[PDB]
Amino acid sequence: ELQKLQWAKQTTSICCYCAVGCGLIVHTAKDGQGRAVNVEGDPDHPINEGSLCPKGASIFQLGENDQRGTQPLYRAPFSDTWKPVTWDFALTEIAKRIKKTRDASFTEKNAAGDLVNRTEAIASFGSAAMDNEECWAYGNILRSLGLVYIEHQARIXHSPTVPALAESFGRGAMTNHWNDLANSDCILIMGSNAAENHPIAFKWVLRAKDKGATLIHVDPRFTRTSARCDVYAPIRSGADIPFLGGLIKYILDNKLYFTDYVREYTNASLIVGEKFSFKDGLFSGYDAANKKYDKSMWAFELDANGVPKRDPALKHPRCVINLLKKHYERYNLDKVAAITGTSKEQLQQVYKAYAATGKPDKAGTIMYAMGWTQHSVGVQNIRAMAMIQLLLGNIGVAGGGVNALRGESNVQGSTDQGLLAHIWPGYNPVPNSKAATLELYNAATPQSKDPMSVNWWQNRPKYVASYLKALYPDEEPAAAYDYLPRIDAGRKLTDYFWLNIFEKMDKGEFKGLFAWGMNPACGGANANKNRKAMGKLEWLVNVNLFENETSSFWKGPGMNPAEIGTEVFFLPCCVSIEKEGSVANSGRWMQWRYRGPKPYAETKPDGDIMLDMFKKVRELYAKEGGAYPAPIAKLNIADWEEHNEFSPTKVAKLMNGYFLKDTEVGGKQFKKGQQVPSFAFLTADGSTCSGNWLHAGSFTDAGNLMARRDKTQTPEQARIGLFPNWSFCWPVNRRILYNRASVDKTGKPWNPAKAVIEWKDGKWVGDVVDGGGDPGTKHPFIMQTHGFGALYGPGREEGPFPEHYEPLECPVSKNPFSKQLHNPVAKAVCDPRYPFIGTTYRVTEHWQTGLMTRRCAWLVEAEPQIFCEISKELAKLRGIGNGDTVKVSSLRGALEAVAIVTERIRPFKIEGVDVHMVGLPWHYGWMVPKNGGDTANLLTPSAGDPNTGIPETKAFMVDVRKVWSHP
Amino acid sequence: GKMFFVDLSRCTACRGCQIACKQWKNLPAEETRNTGSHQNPPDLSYVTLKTVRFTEKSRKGPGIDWLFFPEQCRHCVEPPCKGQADVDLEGAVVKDETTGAVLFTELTAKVDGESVRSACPYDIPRIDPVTKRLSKCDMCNDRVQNGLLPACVKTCPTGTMNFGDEQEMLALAEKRLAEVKKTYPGAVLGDPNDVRVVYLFTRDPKDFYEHAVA
Ligand SMILES: Nc1nc2c(c(=O)[nH]1)N[C@H]1C(S)=C(S)[C@@H](COP(=O)(O)OP(=O)(O)OC[C@H]3O[C@@H](n4cnc5c(=O)[nH]c(N)nc54)[C@H](O)[C@@H]3O)O[C@H]1N2
Ligand SMILES: Nc1nc2c(c(=O)[nH]1)N[C@H]1C(S)=C(S)[C@@H](COP(=O)(O)OP(=O)(O)OC[C@H]3O[C@@H](n4cnc5c(=O)[nH]c(N)nc54)[C@H](O)[C@@H]3O)O[C@H]1N2
Ligand code: SF4
Ligand code: SF4
Ligand code: SF4
Ligand code: SF4
Ligand SMILES: [S]
Ligand SMILES: [W+6]
Distance in Å, CA A51 to ligand 3 centroid: 9
Peptide bond before A446: cis, by omega within 30 degrees of 0? no
Nearest by CB to residue B41, choosing from A228, A861, A882, is A861
Q: Taking ligand 8, which is a single-atom ion, which protein residues have CB atoms under 5 Å away?
A: A 153, 157, 407
Cβ proximity of B177 and B184 under 8 Å: no
Can you give the resolution of this entry in Å?
1.9
**Are A188 and A262 in the same domain?**
yes
**Are A559 and A471 in the same domain?**
no
3-state secondary structure A152-177: CCHHHHCCCCHHHHHHHHCCCCCCCC
The contacts of residue B141 (CB under 8 Å, 6+ apart) are B96, B99, B101, B103
Q: Which of A420, A513, A415, A428 is nearest to A467 (CA)?
A: A428
DSSP A553: G
Binding residues of B: 11, 14, 17, 21, 73, 76, 81, 120, 137, 140, 152, 156
Cβ proximity of A771 and A456 under 8 Å: yes
Residues after which chain A is broken (C–N above 2.5 A) are 826
Distance in Å, CA A409 to ligand 3 centroid: 9
Peptide bond before A127: cis, by omega within 30 degrees of 0? yes
**Are A299 and A180 in the same domain?**
no
How far is it, in rounded angstroms, from Cα A577 to Cα A585?
A: 17
How far is it, in rounded angstroms, from Cα A2 to Cα A7?
A: 10
Write out the DSSP string of A788-810. Answer: SB-SS-TTSTT-SS-------TT
Peptide bond before A724: cis, by omega within 30 degrees of 0? no
**Are A179 and A119 in the same domain?**
no
Q: How many CB atoms lie within 10 A of CB A864?
A: 26
How far is it, in rounded angstroms, from Cα A952 to Cα A945?
A: 8
Q: Which of A242, A194, A519 is nearest to A365 (CA)?
A: A194
Q: At what angle do helices A240-253 and A344-355 cross, to 10 degrees?
A: 60
Nearest-CA distance from B80 to chain A in Å?
30
Phi first, then psi: give them for residue A945, nearest 5 degrees.
Answer: -70, 115
Residues of A in contact with B150 (CB under 8 A): none
**Are A887 and A921 in the same domain?**
yes
User: B interface mutation test: which of A3, A10, A24, A52 has the most B CBs within 10 A?
Assistant: A52
Q: Is A529 exposed, middle or buried (0-12, 13-18, 19+ CB in 10 A)?
A: middle
Distance in Å, CA B143 to ligand 6 centroid: 10
DSSP A29: T
Residues of B in contact with A899 (CB under 8 A): 36
Distance in Å, CA B151 to ligand 6 centroid: 6
Q: How many CB atoms lie within 10 A of CB A831?
A: 12
Cβ proximity of B33 and A929 under 8 Å: no
Q: How many CB atoms lie within 10 A of CB B133?
A: 18
**Are A149 and A161 in the same domain?**
no
Given A692, A710, A734, the domain boundary residue is A734
**Strand order of the sheet with strand A23-28?**
A9-14, A23-28, A36-41
Q: Does A900 touch chain B (CB under 8 A)?
A: yes
Q: Does B22 touch chain A (CB under 8 A)?
A: yes
Residues of B in contact with A216 (CB under 8 A): none
**Are A162 and A130 in the same domain?**
no
Distances in Å between the alpha carbon of A770 and those of A101, A483, A724, A756?
A: 46, 35, 14, 11
Find the Cα–Cα–Cα–Cα dihedral A10, A12, A16, A17, rounded to 10°.
100
Q: For residue A266, what are the β-bridge partners? A: A789
The contacts of residue A176 (CB under 8 Å, 6+ apart) are A365, A398, A400, A401, A403, A587, A735, A736, A737
Q: For residue A195, what are the β-bridge partners? A: none
Provide the 3-class DSSP secondary structure of residue A767. Answer: coil
Pocket lining: A588 vs ligand 1, CB cutoff 6 Å: no
**Are A509 and A619 in the same domain?**
yes
How far is it, in rounded angstroms, from Cα A789 to Cα A780?
A: 8
Cβ proximity of A534 and A505 under 8 Å: yes
Q: Does A965 touch chain B (CB under 8 A)?
A: no
Sign of CA dihedral A297, A302, A306, A309: negative
Nearest by CB to residue B146, choosing from A2, A195, A906, is A2
**Full residue range of the structural domain in which residue A714 is found:** 1-67+268-319+410-487+642-734
DSSP A529: H
**Are A10 and A109 in the same domain?**
no
Q: How many CB atoms lie within 10 A of CB A301?
A: 16
Given A614, A641, A668, the domain boundary residue is A641
Cβ proximity of A522 and A846 under 8 Å: no
How far is it, in rounded angstroms, from Cα A230 to Cα A296?
A: 45
Among A370, A837, A953, say which to mutate for ligand 1: greatest number of ligand atoms within 8 Å of CB. Answer: A370
Q: Does A929 touch chain B (CB under 8 A)?
A: no
**Are A306 and A324 in the same domain?**
no
Number of domains in chain A: 4
Distance in Å, CA A46 to ligand 7 centroid: 24
Given A641, A666, A699, the domain boundary residue is A641
How far is it, in rounded angstroms, from Cα A600 to Cα A31?
A: 16
Residues of A in contact with B29 (CB under 8 A): 857-858, 860-861
Are B19 and A884 inside 8 Å of each other by CB? no
**Are A48 and A79 in the same domain?**
no
Are B155 and A43 inside 8 Å of each other by CB? no
Are B32 and A54 inside 8 Å of each other by CB? no
Distances in Å between the alpha carbon of A949 and those of A390, A418, A506?
A: 29, 18, 16
Q: Which of A551, A561, A508 is nearest to A533 (CA)?
A: A508
Provide the terminal-to-terminal Cα distance of chain B, rounded to the nearest Å: 22
Write out the DSSP string of A710-752. Answer: -----HHHHHHT--TTBSEETTTT-SSTTGGGGB-TTS-BSSG
**Are A525 and A622 in the same domain?**
yes
Are A206 and B63 inside 8 Å of each other by CB? no
Q: Which experimental method was this entry solved with?
A: X-ray
Q: How many CB atoms lie within 10 A of CB A558?
A: 7
How far is it, in rounded angstroms, from Cα B64 to Cα A182?
A: 26
The contacts of residue A374 (CB under 8 Å, 6+ apart) are A156, A157, A160, A945, A948, A950, A951, A952, A953, A954
Q: Judged by CB atoms within 8 Å, which residues 124-143 of A form the interface with B?
A: none
